Amino acid sequence: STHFDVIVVGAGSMGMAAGYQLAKQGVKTLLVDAFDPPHTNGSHHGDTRIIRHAYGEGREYVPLALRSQELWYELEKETHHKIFTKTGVLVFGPKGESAFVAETMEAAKEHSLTVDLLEGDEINKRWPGITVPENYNAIFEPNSGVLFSENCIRAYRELAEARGAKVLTHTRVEDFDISPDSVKIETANGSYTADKLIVSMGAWNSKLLSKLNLDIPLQPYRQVVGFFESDESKYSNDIDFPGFMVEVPNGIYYGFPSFGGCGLRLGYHTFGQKIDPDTINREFGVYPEDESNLRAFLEEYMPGANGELKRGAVCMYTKTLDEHFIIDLHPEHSNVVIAAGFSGHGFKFSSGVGEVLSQLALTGKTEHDISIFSINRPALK
Numbered sequence: 051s052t053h054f055d056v057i058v059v060g061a062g063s064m065g066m067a068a069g070y071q072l073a074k075q076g077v078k079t080l081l082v083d084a085f086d087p088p089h090t091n092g093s094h095h096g097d098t099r100i101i102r103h104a105y106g107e108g109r110e111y112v113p114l115a116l117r118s119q120e121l122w123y124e125l126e127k128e129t130h131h132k133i134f135t136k137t138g139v140l141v142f143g144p145k146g147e148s149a150f151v152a153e154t155m156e157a158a159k160e161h162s163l164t165v166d167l168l169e170g171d172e173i174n175k176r177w178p179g180i181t182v183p184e185n186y187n188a189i190f191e192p193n194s195g196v197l198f199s200e201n202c203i204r205a206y207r208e209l210a211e212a213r214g215a216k217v218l219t220h221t222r223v224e225d226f227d228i229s230p231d232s233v234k235i236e237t238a239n240g241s242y243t244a245d246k247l248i249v250s251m252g253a254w255n256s257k258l259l260s261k262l263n264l265d266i267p268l269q270p271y272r273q274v275v276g277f278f279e280s281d282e283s284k285y286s287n288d289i290d291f292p293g294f295m296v297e298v299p300n301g302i303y304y305g306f307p308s309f310g311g312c313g314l315r316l317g318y319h320t321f322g323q324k325i326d327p328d329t330i331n332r333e334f335g336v337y338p339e340d341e342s343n344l345r346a347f348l349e350e351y352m353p354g355a356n357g358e359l360k361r362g363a364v365c366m367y368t369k370t371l372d373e374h375f376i377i378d379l380h381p382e383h384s385n386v387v388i389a390a391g392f393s394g395h396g397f398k399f400s401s402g403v404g405e406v407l408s409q410l411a412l413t414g415k416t417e418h419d420i421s422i423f424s425i426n427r428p429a430l431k
């Protein structure tokens with residue numbers, strides 16, 4: 051007997067922001083999740099996420115990051131959970147040998163972002179704790195920083211519920227029935243209908259979009275993150291150790307200063323195990339790689355951070371072939387909105403994406419172009 055204006059399937063990073071957008075406008079909204087978000091089975095746990103603005107992956111990302119950033123400052127104001135801490139973000143790599151660093155430096159120049167440029171010994175003088183060869187260069191964004199992604203979800207959820215959004219937890223959606231006039235979901239806990247549907251199931255999008263007759267290659271990856279006891283006089287946020295995303299010989303790594311004395315957190319970005327989200331092994335340390343790829347970085351470039359392993363999390367990316375997101379209406383149903391394929395770099399945009407989703411759902415359009423996220427683009431395959 052339960053008919054909603056909008057149903058959101060998957061109330062994680064994207065879905066919970068979308069639900070908050072909709073509920074804020076008095077849209078009667080049901081959010082359905084396989085768990086009880088924020089949880090540790092998806093792509094949003096491990097405590098912290100980088101947001102940075104000098105986004106070389108495409109010009110369209112730059113305004114989405116800056117809008118997202120403003121929206122995270124707004125969410126900070128609205129809630130008692132902590133959202134954002136402005137640690138700055140350091141990008142470094144070997145000079146002339148890093149398309150990532152080069153593209154980062156261009157987007158900054160091209161969008162007039164405020165940034166510092168440094169190189170070689172300057173990097174280690176500015177942040178003791180960093181040890182790079184004298185041939186490395188860097189670009190520091192002083193105004194970006196670190197999101198607390200689980201708090202962001204919890205905040206969006208509390209605020210959506212306050213305005214009347216319903217969240218059906220521990221309920222896996224199993225199928226979809228889409229008419230021109232409604233949408234329907236089927237679950238072990240019952241069926242629900244609405245005018246509009248947003249689909250944002252994170253890694254499970256790779257198995258479940260076929261239920262909507264779509265065939266999009268989406269590869270989920272096993273991505274671990276470890277938290278290490280650290281020299282606080284070098285890696286503490288309080289001494290301006292930055293968040294970072296850097297390129298070295300064996301690939302790209304990301305990480306976070308120590309907050310509250312808890313330990314530097316680090317992740318290896320360019321490698322992960324190909325997995326299925328239902329059979330992923332979420333134990334940190336089951337492959338020797340989990341800890342060794344991270345120590346290999348630490349001992350070379352951040353040796354005072356290479357302490358006892360305090361904790362590891364196992365999390366998931368869901369890549370498209372072009373590593374761009376998919377944000378678009380279903381091509382055969384204008385009442386179904388798809389958010390998928392965030393490719394290991396979506397969380398920072400999740401506030402802005404929630405806004406864009408809520409617009410697609412309510413109007414079939416959004417205020418700025420979004421064509422690089424087209425579900426009909428050919429490089430998706």
Ligand SMILES: Cc1cc2nc3c(=O)[nH]c(=O)nc-3n(C[C@H](O)[C@H](O)[C@H](O)COP(=O)(O)OP(=O)(O)OC[C@H]3O[C@@H](n4cnc5c(N)ncnc54)[C@H](O)[C@@H]3O)c2cc1C
Nearest residue numbers: 060062063064084092093100223252365366392396397398
């Ligand atoms: C280790 C790691 C570090 C990262 N670091 C960064 C970073 O520093 N900066 C950054 O921008 N991004 C980062 N990312 C990526 C970012 O976290 C993801 O791109 C983003 O969270 C994707 O959000 P989502 O809503 O698609 O998925 P999720 O937040 O996982 O949400 C999808 C939801 O769908 C639910 N669901 C699944 N199946 C069903 C079903 N059948 N029925 C109902 N519900 C279902 C799941 O329970 C889940 O809650 C990182 C990711 C990882 C794994």
Ligand SMILES: [Cl-]
Nearest residue numbers: 367368393394
């Ligand atoms: Cl992802």
